Design an enzyme around this catalytic site. Structure first.
Site, short mmCIF file in Angstrom:
data_model
loop_
_atom_site.label_atom_id
_atom_site.label_comp_id
_atom_site.label_asym_id
_atom_site.label_seq_id
_atom_site.Cartn_x
_atom_site.Cartn_y
_atom_site.Cartn_z
N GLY A 69 0.79 -1.23 0.00
CA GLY A 69 0.00 0.00 0.00
C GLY A 69 0.82 1.28 0.00
O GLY A 69 2.05 1.25 0.07
N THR A 70 0.12 2.42 -0.07
CA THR A 70 0.77 3.73 -0.09
C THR A 70 1.32 4.09 1.29
O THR A 70 0.92 3.51 2.29
CB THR A 70 -0.19 4.85 -0.55
N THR A 71 2.23 5.06 1.32
CA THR A 71 2.91 5.44 2.56
C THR A 71 2.00 6.32 3.43
O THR A 71 1.37 7.26 2.94
CB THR A 71 4.22 6.20 2.28
#
Ligand SMILES: [Cl-]
Ligand SMILES: [Mg+2]
Ligand SMILES: [Mg+2]
Lengths: 111, 235, 243, 195, 231, 250, 240, 241, 244
Positions: free
Chosen positions: C29-31
């Protein structure tokens, strides 16, 4: 002891012509000897060229009208936007009222 | 083993696709819609000569204005018919009117995907639902176990379906009469059936606005079979 | 073998491979990050712009619980929403019975026990999210991070997602260079920088910055989104640092 | 309903039951048969609250008929009476009890003996040579106490029964519109068409 | 492979294959396009038939006077999800006398789909939805995927060959967003967008399905000779 | 969630074997030796207190348990399974008997109830069988003294004397030679200590051995006086000192 | 509760559990049904592997559902008891609610519906039983004979057989039974039913059971000696 | 080989899932120790904060179950907290129903019974934790009772748990072999804590700072944990003799 | 999920057999032989205890023969624990019938009820069947003396003489040879013991390896008496018939 019913007064009148119909009602809302409102609408346009008024106990009358308006909406969804005939609406309302045979809607209804 | 409601890598429900294979093994049923009425016809397919063929009930009344033909695991259709009849009469109770053919078909198709781990598997039967209402007129629907239903001008289901459907592709036009449709169902049934077609191993029915849904007598069908033979021999 | 096919099964190691596979979805997933400051907390997240057709500032990722708690997560977004919905039920029943708003450590355990419960049976799947959350209560500011196993700890700074290593390194510098502490407005600026620096791991597509904060002085201990001039000021500070 | 009588003689059981049915102030029917055949050699008459009587009788009838088919065997009058009693004893502590009193007349083919059982709505069972329900016994039991012998014939049983009905017709205020009489013996159940 | 038997099982790389297989059903489905301006929002759908005797499967469903969607994939699943929306839109009206926000409608669909992806026995929904609506914050367009992911967009497309229409909208972004107070021109842009996904077949009178909602425009569906204007 | 294991985990194999019951019996075989001997005026049950660590206080772990005032139990196999069975056995003696009849159940009927619980774990959904064999000694007015064995299957048998667990085969042979129908309780205790010494490796004393008897009524252990008919429990656990005294005359 | 889907479709479109239930029927003892002009006869095989049997108390193969309807079967014996009980309950339930005894067609439709329900319900297996249901409708002199099977399909038959070696006796009935002129009397109907079983049975001693059902609730079971007379007459004519 | 996935017997009469739960116990790589004084019960545990970003005050494996009972856990924190919450609920329910404070050994038994159920019922997995309960019971005095994933429990004179449990166990064994008593003959709890730390240092062969340890102390009518500064004062006294 | 570990106890084989029922019958074939013989003036029940020990308390032991009521008894072959579950249900059913109809339950009705319970475990629930076969010996005033058997399939049949458990093939042949319809109880006792003595897997048939019972009208006038034989009484009848 708690009494769930009340009487908001008012009177309604329906007359059928040859190619038209009227549904009339006074705009007064009351409890006992006091006036609640001098203009509280009681007769409604429910869609599909049908008008309705539930006179007696306003809380039950507002709930019934609200339910029937909803019934009209779902009739369009379920049956391809078909127009609800006045005779079909009448029969539908019978079943809304009898759903509370043992805790009645305290209203005299006219469409 | 594996889930009943499992998707295949192609994006299809295994059990639904397998039920369609069972329907291909079923006896042939054909429907043709016209402006004078809708005709429904079926192959009875008795497994033995001692079996009283008139007890084979593969065409069924749902309401006075709606009829139904079936193909596949015909035992599975009984609960679907029961639900359809209940839905049709219940709507008449609530709304004091006949129910739309499409709305009836939708009510039947809502049962289709109610399976999991509700019933344990999809239905193994397809239905041809034919009828008439004031709004959309004469209609023919094909109800599958996937929950999908298509309207058709003409449709064949069962073992000889793709051959019959190709024949219906050429023969159907918008100006067909009822009599022409009757002979056309008999013609195509005779083409795909294993045994020789007669009044005992094949059944006709129709739905008209005036007379409603009617299953044809064996005497009445026999005359239409004889009328077919003569007109084919005419050229 | 076969120990990784079913949830709640111990391998011969003593490991739950299904929970470890859930972590892989989080890492994909995204940060997202969290920073604890003097009198509150700051949350920030990376939103990948997949297409020009995405409406800017509309697909909001950070979620509020009650009025004083902020939640952000990386991984399967729907799983995160499910967890926040539960968190909101937990916070509501706490306040209903005890009157006071739910303390952050109390709230942290409510999520923890719920996530842990999804590692006890084969009839459920573990959560595919790591959740960074916190806020301000009677005892001050608190920041937490919660993993798929149900494991959570308190943090000075927290980071998860594809750019977590880059973020963690930047967070460690702030802890060393500011032992006396960091202000709320500083933390917002630093949060923007860290997300921009962490974006090198997702450098293919361009992104949108989203920040929120709870602070005793700046927001009266309530959760609020960083908007308008304060957001642009943080973006400018971040853009200046990468160049 | 109103009056149901029963008498057990030498070789048969005789049941007499009134014909009247009343709603409001009007007698709707004067030919009502207040009885159901439970099995070929077992008859049950009934009396109580409106509607409950027939519903209960038909429910019992169905259960005994089900037993007969399952076992290909007729239950003894004693066994049937015990089954009925339990259903009434179960009923009295229900939300809405069935307000029904019954007489069960049967001929036991095994023992070659007639048997009469009186059961009220509470589930109070008693085997008797003669019985009645409600106020019927107040007028008739004195006659039966006097005239009854256990070695009486069926014809003598009918004559003693006629005397009971005549006394009821004289001293009861209510008009019950006469009675339908039925005899239960070794050959089965038959109705006396002239009474 | 070994991790695609049910929805309750992660793969070693953290993937949910049953959800991905459900996503595959959408790609097999017929193309549908969604786009909006500041005043109106439009749905355009290519309907599919079984054969020449059959009717063309309906793609667009009305949910309220101010909201509706188009489908791509398993049609029965769309009927279930649209029925749920109808109820939620209706709960908002009856209880709060409030028209349901399009954004909140998306949140409710997300959460409903999610429950099916985490529990044993059930299955994910096998359909994608494009929701349009007009509420108190103007016109809106949403894209729903049965993974649970819901996304607010200016324009989009789903189904077979949907990449062509999506590229067109990505170029036209600045033009069609400005089409305010002009429903016919916004529909034209949608019809031109869906045309980029066509091969062999072209837009006929019983093939094309269009829907629109706006400022002083209730959600209405156009089929048959009503769309001949736009062919 | 929900317990979705509504199906049996114990099933018949092609050979007619019930695998999980057999495997449960194998777990019992690995367990520490325990035994029971019936005398004319009493019953004795005994086992080794196999302490897991010398830091552990072995007095706190009770392998021999009171079920009713006149009934006691000992086991071989999985301790935790035994502990919960004792809890259930104690409760069922009250719910299904004492609260109905106003007196404690006879040995054979309490055994029957315990057996039923163990059988259900062999057939019910989503459970494994209990991994223990029980020896239940007791007394009641109309049946006198009795000793019963109960297996993982739920089957139970009455014994004059027997042994279960590790060295049961050798122990049963030892008991066959020594047992007779004229044994006094003290003679049975002596034989129990002799038999148990063979299976024990290490220390053999009152602190490493657990032993209880069903014998005469103990009015001193009743806790109250005033009711003549209440004469006290027949179950008594022997102390560490009482065991050591009998090991000198061994 | 146990909800497992045991009856499911296979790739080729078959429900194997339903098909394997038919194999259980194939294993069962042979049952035959023949309807005459004014009667129906139900014949049943009794396997002679079991001697030292008490024929007084052993469950008979033909079962009365009501006073006017009977049911015989082939397949699992224990499974058949459940269908028979349900059928008997429904028969009394119909009399109680509609005030008419069930028609033979209705009773068959109910039993067939039960069998069908057990092919798409969770946690249950299909009945390993096929039935022959025969009788006369109330106030009707037309004979009725129906057949059901595990899948739940049912149909009416002029004559039919089920169970082991049913293929052989059906072959016999197909050439011997004439529709234009069926067995006019009871004798002719029973004779044809015994003849058909003699193709398969082995010995004509205690292996054949016959049950004659006539209109107006007239049902009787033939004895050993009565059947033995038919067996004697058939073979004496055959020696020619 | 599905007998190794759920809690059913293997052919050897073994429960592999229970055995693998025991192995999860050492996943944290932490060692704990418990000893009894005259008036008190002391429990110490290693504390390891590897990440600098962590808030060290929130990193703990010691729990205050009730006012009188304390619990230290050996195993992963999610299962530890699961057990802690349940023990707290059970302790409170006991007091409400029976009108007195739940004893340490009774709570241990209850938690052991719950663990036993997970070894018998298939749908529930065992918790990968060893629970050590400590108190000064009003009847039995200083008390140490320990539970494991098998559902086994027993009282202890002293005990140790973790990867290096055997080294600590033998160290304690050798001390009690000399003194010939079942406890630490010491008046103040401060000196009993000093004993506990000293003997862990000797057994493990490592020195400890104030942040390397975590200490819990049970006295009559209360259980409490020590702060870092309280531990530092304890470490100073050890070094000065 | 849980599906992975389901053995599916209630399914058909491709040949149309119930796997678990067949395997349960295989289990029962290793159990101690039980024999029932019906005579004109009574019924005999004989059964063999499995490899006993000298230290087993026989006089208080019961593994084969159980009393359902005053008129009906059963001989067991299979898992004793499974049998006791069913026996207690049957005891209750008999008392329910007595309470309802005020008459002792007819033998067949009791047998059908137990057999219906066994049937249920083969068709639904997903549980293993009961690994038990019963021989029912009973009396009522309709059919008089009756012998029945039921097995895990839930199928039951009536018999003049029958065996269950081990060596039934051999035992049934011996019974079929020497049995006659005009036989009496004393003769049936001898036949039962002689059959066990020849079919037994043991070296010699002794009193301590047997359970024995009779149901006789040999009670004072028109009534029935159940006699469960004591160890000493089994020893006497073994000497009387000339086996030991
Ligand atoms: Cl407990
Ligand atoms: Mg009375
Ligand atoms: Mg488990």
């Amino acid at each position: 002891q708690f009494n769930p019913y009340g009487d908001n007064g008012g009177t309604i009148l329906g007359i059928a012509g040859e190619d038209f119909a009227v549904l009339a009602g006074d705009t007064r809302n009351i409890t006992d000897y006091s006036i609640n409102s001098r203009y509280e609408p009681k007769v409604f346009d429910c869609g599909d060229n049908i008008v309705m008024s539930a006179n007696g106990f306003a809380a039950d009358g507002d709930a019934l009208v609200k339910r029937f308006k909803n019934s009209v909406k779902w009739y369009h969804f379920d049956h391809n936007d078909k127009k609800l005939s006045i005779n079909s609406a009448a029969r539908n309302i019978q079943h809304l009222l009898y759903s509370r045979r043992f805790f009645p809607y305290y209203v005299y209804n006219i469409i | 083993d594996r889930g009943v409601s499992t998707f295949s890598p192609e994006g299809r429900l295994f059990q639904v696709e397998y039920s369609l294979e069972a329907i291909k093994l079923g006896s042939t049923a054909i429907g043709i819609a016209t402006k004078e009425g809708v005709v429904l016809g079926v192959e009875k397919r008795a497994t033995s000569p001692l079996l009283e063929s008139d007890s084979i009930e593969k065409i069924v009344e749902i309401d006075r204005h709606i009829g139904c033909a079936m193909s596949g695991l015909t035992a599975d259709a009984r609960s679907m018919i029961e639900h359809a009849r209940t839905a049709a009469v219940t709507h008449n109770l609530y709304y004091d009117e006949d129910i739309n053919v499409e709305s009836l078909t939708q009510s039947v198709c809502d049962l289709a995907l109610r399976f999991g781990e509700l019933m344990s598997r999809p239905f193994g039967v397809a239905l041809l639902i034919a009828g008439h209402d004031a709004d959309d007129g004469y209609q023919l629907f094909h109800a599958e176990p996937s929950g999908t239903f298509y309207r058709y001008n003409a449709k064949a289901i069962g073992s000889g379906s793709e051959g019959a459907q190709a024949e219906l592709l050429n023969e159907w036009h918008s100006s067909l009469t009822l009599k022409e449709a009757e002979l056309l169902v008999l013609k195509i049934l005779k083409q795909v059936m294993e045994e020789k077609l007669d009044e005992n191993n094949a059944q006709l029915s129709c739905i008209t606005k005036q007379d409603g849904f009617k299953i044809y007598d064996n005497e009445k069908t026999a005359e239409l079979i004889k009328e077919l033979k003569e007109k084919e021999a005419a050229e | 073998t076969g120990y990784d096919l079913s949830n709640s099964v111990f391998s011969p190691d003593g490991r739950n491979f299904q929970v470890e596979y859930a972590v892989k979805a989080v890492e994909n997933g995204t940060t997202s990050i969290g920073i604890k400051c003097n009198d509150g907390v700051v949350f920030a997240v990376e939103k990948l712009i997949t297409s020009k057709l995405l409406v800017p500032q509309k697909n909001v990722k950070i979620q509020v619980v009650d009025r004083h708690i902020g939640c952000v997560y990386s991984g399967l977004i729907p799983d995160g929403r499910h967890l926040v919905n539960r968190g909101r039920e937990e916070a509501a029943s706490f306040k209903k019975l005890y009157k006071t708003p739910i303390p952050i450590p109390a709230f942290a355990d409510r999520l923890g026990q719920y996530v842990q419960a999804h590692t006890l049976y084969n009839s459920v799947r573990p959560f595919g999210v790591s959740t960074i959350f916190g806020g301000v209560d009677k005892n001050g500011a608190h920041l937490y991070m919660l993993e798929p196993s149900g494991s959570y700890w308190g943090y000075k700074g927290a980071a998860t997602g594809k750019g977590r290593q880059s973020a963690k390194a930047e967070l460690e510098k702030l802890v060393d260079h500011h032992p006396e502490g960091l202000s709320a407005r500083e933390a917002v600026k630093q949060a923007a920088k860290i997300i921009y620096l962490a974006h090198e791991d997702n450098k293919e597509k361009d992104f949108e910055l989203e920040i929120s904060w709870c602070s005793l002085s700046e927001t009266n201990g309530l959760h609020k989104f960083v908007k308008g001039d304060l957001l642009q000021e943080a973006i400018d500070f971040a853009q200046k640092e990468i160049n | 309903m109103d009056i149901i009588l029963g008498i057990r003689v030498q070789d048969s059981v005789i049941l007499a039951s009134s014909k009247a049915v009343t709603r409001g102030i009007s007698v709707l029917k004067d030919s009502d048969d207040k009885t159901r055949q439970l099995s070929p050699h077992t008859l049950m008459s009934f009396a109580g609250e409106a509607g409950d009587t027939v519903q209960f009788a038909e429910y019992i009838q169905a259960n005994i008929q089900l037993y007969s088919i399952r076992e290909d065997y007729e239950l003894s009058p004693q066994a049937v009476s015990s089954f009925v009693r339990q259903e009434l004893a179960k009923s009295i502590r229900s939300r809405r009890p069935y307000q029904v009193n019954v007489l069960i007349g049967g001929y036991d083919k095994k023992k070659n003996k007639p048997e009469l059982y009186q059961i009220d709505y509470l589930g109070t069972k008693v085997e008797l040579p003669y019985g009645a329900h409600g106020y019927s016994g107040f007028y008739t039991f004195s006659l039966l106490d006097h005239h009854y012998r256990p070695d009486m014939t069926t014809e003598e049983g009918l004559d003693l029964l006629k005397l009971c009905v005549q006394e009821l017709e004289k001293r009861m205020p209510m008009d019950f519109k006469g009675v339908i009489v039925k005899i239960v013996d070794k050959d089965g159940i038959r109705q006396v068409d002239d009474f | 492979n070994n991790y695609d038997g049910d929805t309750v099982t992660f793969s070693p790389t953290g993937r949910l294959f049953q959800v991905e297989y459900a996503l595959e059903a959408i790609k097999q489905g017929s193309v549908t396009v969604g786009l909006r301006s500041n005043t109106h929002a439009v749905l355009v759908a290519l309907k599919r038939n079984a054969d020449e005797l059959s009717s063309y499967q309906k793609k667009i469903i009305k949910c309220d006077e101010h909201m509706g969607l188009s489908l791509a994939g398993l049609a029965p699943d769309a009927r279930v999800l649209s029925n749920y929306l109808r109820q939620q839109c209706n709960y908002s009206s009856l209880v709060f006398n409030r028209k349901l926000a399009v954004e909140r409608a998306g949140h409710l669909l997300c959460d409903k789909a999610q429950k099916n992806t985490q529990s044993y026995g059930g299955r994910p929904y096998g359909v994608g939805l494009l929701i349009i609506g007009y509420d108190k914050s103007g016109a809106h367009l949403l894209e729903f995927q049965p993974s649970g992911n819901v996304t607010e967009l200016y324009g989009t497309a789903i189904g077979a060959r949907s990449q062509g229409a999506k590229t067109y909208l990505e170029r036209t972004l600045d033009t069609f967003i400005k089409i305010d107070g002009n429903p016919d021109e916004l529909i034209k842009a949608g019809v031109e967008a869906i045309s980029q996904s066509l091969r062999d077949e072209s837009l006929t009178v019983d093939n094309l399905s269009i829907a629109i909602v706006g400022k002083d425009t209730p959600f209405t569906i156009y089929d048959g000779e009503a769309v001949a204007k736009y062919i | 969630m929900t317990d979705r294991y509504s199906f049996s985990l114990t099933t018949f194999s092609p050979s007619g074997k019930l695998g999980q019951i057999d495997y449960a019996l194998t777990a019992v075989k690995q367990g520490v030796t325990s035994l029971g001997i019936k005398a004319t005026n009493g019953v004795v049950i005994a086992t080794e207190k196999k302490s897991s660590s010398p830091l552990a206080m072995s007095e706190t772990l009770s392998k021999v348990s009171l079920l009713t005032p006149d009934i006691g139990a000992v086991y071989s196999g999985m301790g935790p399974d035994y502990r919960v069975l004792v809890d259930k056995s104690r409760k069922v003696a009250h719910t299904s008997y004492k609260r109905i009849y106003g007196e404690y159940p006879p040995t054979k009927l309490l055994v029957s109830e315990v057996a039923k619980i163990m059988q259900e774990a062999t057939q019910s959904g989503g459970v494994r069988p209990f991994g223990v064999s029980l020896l239940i000694a007791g007394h009641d007015e109309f049946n006198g003294f009795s000793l019963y064995q109960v297996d993982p299957s739920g089957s139970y048998f009455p014994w004059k004397a027997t042994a279960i667990g590790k060295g049961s085969v050798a122990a049963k042979t030892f008991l066959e030679k020594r047992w007779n129908d004229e044994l006094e309780l003290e003679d049975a205790i002596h034989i129990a200590l002799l038999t148990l010494k063979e299976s024990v490796e290490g220390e053999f004393n009152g602190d490493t051995i657990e032993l209880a008897i069903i014998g005469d009524e103990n009015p001193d252990l009743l806790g109250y006086t005033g009711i003549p008919t209440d004469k006290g429990p027949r179950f008594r656990k022997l102390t560490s000192q009482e065991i050591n005294d009998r090991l000198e005359a061994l | 509760g146990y909800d497992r889907a045991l009856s499911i479709f296979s790739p080729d479109g078959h429900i194997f559990q339903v098909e394997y239930a038919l194999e259980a029927v194939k294993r069962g003892t042979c049952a035959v049904g023949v309807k005459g002009k004014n009667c129906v006869v139900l014949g049943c095989e009794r396997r002679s592997t079991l001697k030292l049997q008490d024929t007084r108390i052993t469950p008979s193969k033909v079962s009365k559902i009501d006073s006017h309807v009977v049911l015989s079967f082939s397949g699992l014996n224990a499974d058949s008891r459940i269908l028979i009980e349900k059928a008997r309950v429904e028969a009394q339930s119909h009399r109680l609610t509609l005030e008419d005894p069930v028609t033979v067609e209705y009773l068959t439709r109910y039993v067939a519906g039960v069998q069908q329900r057990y092919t798409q319900s969770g946690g249950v297996r299909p009945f390993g039983v096929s039935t022959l249901i025969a009788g006369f409708d109330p106030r009707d002199d037309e004979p009725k004979l129906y057949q059901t099977e595990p899948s739940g399909i049912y149909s009416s038959w002029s004559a039919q057989t089920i169970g082991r070696n049913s293929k052989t006796v059906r072959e016999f009935l197909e050439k011997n039974y004439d529709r234009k002129e069926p067995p006019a009397t009871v004798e002719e109907c029973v004779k044809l039913t015994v003849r058909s079983l003699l193709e398969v049975v082995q010995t004509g001693a205690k292996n054949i059971e016959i049950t004659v059902v006539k209109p107006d609730s007239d049902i009787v079971a033939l004895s050993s000696e009565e059947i033995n007379q038919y067996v004697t007459q058939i073979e004496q004519e055959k020696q020619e | 080989g599905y007998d190794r996935h759920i809690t059913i017997f293997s052919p050897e009469g073994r429960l592999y899932q229970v055995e693998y739960a025991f192995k999860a116990t050492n996943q944290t790589n932490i060692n704990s120790l418990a000893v009894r004084g005259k008036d008190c019960t002391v429990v110490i545990s290693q504390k390891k904060v590897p990440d600098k970003l962590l808030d060290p005050t929130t990193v703990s494996y010691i729990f205050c179950i009730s006012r009188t009972i304390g619990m230290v856990v050996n195993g992963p924190i999610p299962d530890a907290r699961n057990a802690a919450l349940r023990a707290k609920a059970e302790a409170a329910e006991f007091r409400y129903k029976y009108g007195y404070d739940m004893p340490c050994d009774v709570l241990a038994k209850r938690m052991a019974n719950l663990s036993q159920i997970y070894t018998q019922r298939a749908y529930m997995r065992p918790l990968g934790v060893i629970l050590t309960f400590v108190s000064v019971d009003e009847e039995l005095g200083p008390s140490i009772y320990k539970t494991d994933p098998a559902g086994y429990y027993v009282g202890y004179k002293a005990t140790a748990t973790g990867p290096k449990q055997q080294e600590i166990t033998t160290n304690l064994e050798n001390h009690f072999k000399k003194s010939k008593i079942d406890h630490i003959n010491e008046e103040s709890w401060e000196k009993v804590v000093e004993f506990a730390i000293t003997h862990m240092i000797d057994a493990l062969g490592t020195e400890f700072s104030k942040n390397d340890l975590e200490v819990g102390v049970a006295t009559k009518d209360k259980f409490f944990t020590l702060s870092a500064e309280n531990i530092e004062e304890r470490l100073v006294a050890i070094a000065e003799q | 999920g849980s599906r992975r570990y389901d053995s599916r106890t209630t399914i058909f084989s491709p040949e149309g057999r119930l796997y678990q029922v067949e395997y349960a019958l295989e289990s029962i074939s290793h159990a101690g032989t039980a024999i029932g013989i019906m005579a004109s003036d009574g019924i005999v029940l004989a059964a063999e205890r499995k490899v006993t020990s000298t230290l087993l308390e026989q006089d208080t032991s019961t593994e084969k023969l159980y009393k359902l009521n005053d008129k009906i008894a059963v001989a067991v072959a299979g898992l004793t624990a499974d049998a006791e579950i069913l026996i207690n249900t049957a005891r209750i059913h008999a008392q329910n019938y007595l309470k309802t109809y005020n008459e002792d339950i007819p033998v067949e009705i009791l047998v059908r009820r137990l057999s219906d319970i066994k049937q249920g475990y083969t068709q639904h629930g997903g549980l293993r069947p009961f690994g038990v076969s019963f021989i029912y010996a009973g009396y009522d005033d309709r059919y008089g003396y009756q012998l029945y058997t039921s097995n895990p399939s839930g199928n039951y049949t009536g018999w003049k003489a029958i065996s269950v458990g081990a060596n039934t093939s051999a035992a049934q042949t011996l019974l079929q040879m020497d049995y006659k319809d005009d036989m009496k109880v004393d003769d049936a006792i001898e036949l039962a013991l002689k059959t066990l003595s020849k079919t037994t897997d043991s070296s010699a048939l002794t009193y301590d390896r047997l359970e024995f019972a009779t149901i006789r009208k040999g009670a004072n006038d028109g009534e029935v008496y159940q006699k469960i034989f004591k160890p000493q009484e089994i020893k006497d009848i073994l000497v009387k018939t000339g086996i030991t």
